[PDB]
Design a protein around this ligand. Structure first.
Ligand SMILES: [Ca+2]
Ligand SMILES: [Ca+2]
Ligand SMILES: [Ca+2]
Ligand SMILES: [Ca+2]
Lengths: 69, 73
């Protein structure tokens, strides 16, 4: 389990582009779609809402783990 | 639907770890992601890969990466 934990940490760090400890809509859209559309942004917003435990519109590491485990 | 999203993020995570896009994470790629290596570090990585290598080739493919992310039923 430790190794999957370590890789979950690394994955978050790489998605958290600006290193503030939160994945935003803009960061998540960028990872999901490497010049993308409003429709895509709204779909990302809805995804975040399914796992956003503190309702701030972002995904922190705890929320990322909860979603992964 | 939240299963679907975790699945999408597991795909994206793999892709980013698989630096050269050949569909396999190798010792060198995993070491690179784990360490911002000495021989000791390389061997530590090789041991981690062993724990989850299912086809005994010393690399982690997406299927193995996914399996590792979930419980053994
Ligand atoms: Ca961030
Ligand atoms: Ca949040
Ligand atoms: Ca590779
Ligand atoms: Ca393998």
């Amino acid at each position: 389990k430790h190794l999957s934990k370590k890789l979950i940490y690394c994955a978050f760090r790489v998605f958290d582009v600006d290193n503030d400890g939160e994945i935003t809509t803009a960061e998540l859209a960028h990872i999901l779609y490497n010049s993308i559309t409003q429709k895509d942004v709204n779909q990302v917003k809805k995804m975040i809402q399914e796992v956003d435990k503190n309702n701030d519109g972002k995904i922190d590491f705890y929320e990322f783990c909860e979603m992964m485990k």
